[PDB]
Design a protein around this ligand. Sequence first.
Ligand SMILES: O=C(O)CNC(=O)C(=O)O
Ligand SMILES: [Mg+2]
Ligand code: NI
Ligand SMILES: [Zn+2]
Length: 331
Amino acid sequence: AQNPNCNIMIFHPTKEEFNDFDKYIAYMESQGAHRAGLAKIIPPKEWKARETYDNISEILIATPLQQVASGRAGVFTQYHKKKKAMTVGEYRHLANSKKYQTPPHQNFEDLERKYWKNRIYNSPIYGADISGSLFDENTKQWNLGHLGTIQDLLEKECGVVIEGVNTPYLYFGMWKTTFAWHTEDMDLYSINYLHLGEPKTWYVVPPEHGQRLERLARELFPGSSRGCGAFLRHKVALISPTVLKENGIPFNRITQEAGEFMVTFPYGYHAGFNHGFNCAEAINFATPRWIDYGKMASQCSCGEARVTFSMDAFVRILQPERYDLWKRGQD
Ligand SMILES: O=C(O)CNC(=O)C(=O)O
Ligand SMILES: [Mg+2]
Ligand code: NI
Ligand SMILES: [Zn+2]
């Protein structure tokens, strides 16, 4: 069995290997990459996403989100307070202001220490989930707006034709902006490209050990767990590496830098934070190996998780017994 310790693997495809996206995902899995829940892919030196980022300041962040924490430094939830619209140029200036800018630090490890010590005492503002793309239309390799769709994968594997679409999303971050512990909708894959700016640190639990994280989360967030049998789908809970280690939860960590891709694998729980002003693009995708995870994915039916239009068909076809309850939670 490849990668039995479930380490995060880093890949350096050649320009030739970068042509066929599906084939390369399958290659990484042949080497055991999925066992970690997360892999890094460094593009060949010949590749670029677009020519320059000199022209992005006019993108609008219609609903910036202030991420307000509650709890203790290592075990907390966050809620999102909506703020007035601003441009990417305005948001960049805000990220670089004395109130929000990255503190002086020695290295990524010192900054990680500072994040976990101090995160709860600040409320950083995140531009999340903005439909759009920064890949040039002429970029043919690993262009996240030109991937094969999840609807087409489901049709190819299962024969059924369904409604829905699958487009990318932009994320604008600042110091301490946080992504809570989660798997993807329907335990899909994700791919994330860091277009520009400061790094993103990731934490991940191997898929084979995801239920260990769920059981700890129920213990640590006991009111939330009574409210909903899949409350991690709410995407509000944070648990630090120190607390994970105290409780024996297997996990790994890695820092993504500008120009790098990360792939999350089905049922790979992940969380993390941004080091400073940055911009990422991400989208969900599927392969044949996903279908069994989609059929078994948990679902939130309490009303909180609320998701895209396109998840309806996935539930309806893969999880018909759960469909009526889940759709009530949508309505
Ligand atoms: O970058 C972020 O804030 C969150 N991204 C992801 O969870 C992802 O790409 O799957
Ligand atoms: Mg612009
Ligand atoms: Ni994710
Ligand atoms: Zn719920």
